[PDB]
Amino acid sequence: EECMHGSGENYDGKISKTMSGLECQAWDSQSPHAHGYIPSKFPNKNLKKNYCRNPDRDLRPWCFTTDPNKRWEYCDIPRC
Amino acid sequence: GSAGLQEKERELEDLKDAELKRLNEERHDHDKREAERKALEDKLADKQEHLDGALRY
């Protein structure tokens, strides 16, 4: 689905940009922001490439930004 | 297991229990940290200077 119904826990779209317009950092990458959201650690969260996901049960899907001045930001994904 | 149901359940309920257990207690402090850090930048910029410096929150 390229849209979300609720919080976006089941969102497996190809959107890889935050609401700020920044390209999300790869979940399999520790650059430029280091994290513990390892795709192999959470395989049931469908962490692929740098697509916006909701693996922590947040309000809206998010991702790490490409800006070292901002750890992470929420993504802008349309609702169904 | 014997029926292979365990491999089907994949301990999804077990993982979900940890989700609410953690509740992003760590990430919460991280966000709050960056919040004041960003504000510090404005204080260094001095656009208005509405901080006497006596209390400093």
Radius of gyration of chain B: 23 Å
The number of helical segments of chain B is: 3
Cα Rg of chain A: 11 Å
Structural class of chain B: mainly alpha
Beta percentage of chain A is: 5-15%
Global geometry of chain B: rod-shaped
Order of helices and strands of chain A: EE
Main structural class of chain A: little secondary structure
CATH H-level name of chain A... which superfamily?
Answer: Plasminogen Kringle 4
Give the oligomeric state. Answer: heterodimer
PDB class: protein binding
Keywords: Plasminogen binding peptide, protein binding
Assembly: dimeric
Entry title: Solution structure of AGL55-Kringle 2 complex
Description:
- The complex is a heterodimer of chains A (80) and B (57).
- Chain A has no helices and two strands.
- By secondary structure, chain A is mostly loops.
- Chain A has a single domain (1-80), classed as Plasminogen Kringle 4 (Beta Barrel).
- Chain A is globular and about 30 Å long.
- Chain A starts with 61 loop residues before the first strand and ends in a 6-residue tail after the last strand.
- In chain A, 25% of the residues are buried.
- Chain B is mostly helical and 57 residues long.
- Chain B has helices spanning 5-9, 12-22, 25-45.
- The longest helix of chain B is centred in the middle third of the chain and has 21 residues, at 25-45.
- Chain B is rod-shaped and about 70 Å long.
- The termini of chain B are far apart.
- The A-B interface holds A 44, 56-58, 70-71 and B 10, 12, 15, 19-20, 24, 27, 30-31, 34.
Name its key features.
heterodimer; A: 80 residues; little secondary structure; Plasminogen Kringle 4; two-stranded antiparallel sheet; 0% helix; B: 57 residues; mainly alpha; 65% helix; Angiostatin (chain A); M protein (chain B)
Topology of helices and strands:
The complex is a heterodimer of chains A (80) and B (57).
Chain A (H helix, E strand, L loop, with lengths): L61 E3 L7 E3 L6
Antiparallel strand pairs in A: 1-2
Chain B lengths: L4 H5 L2 H11 L2 H21 L12
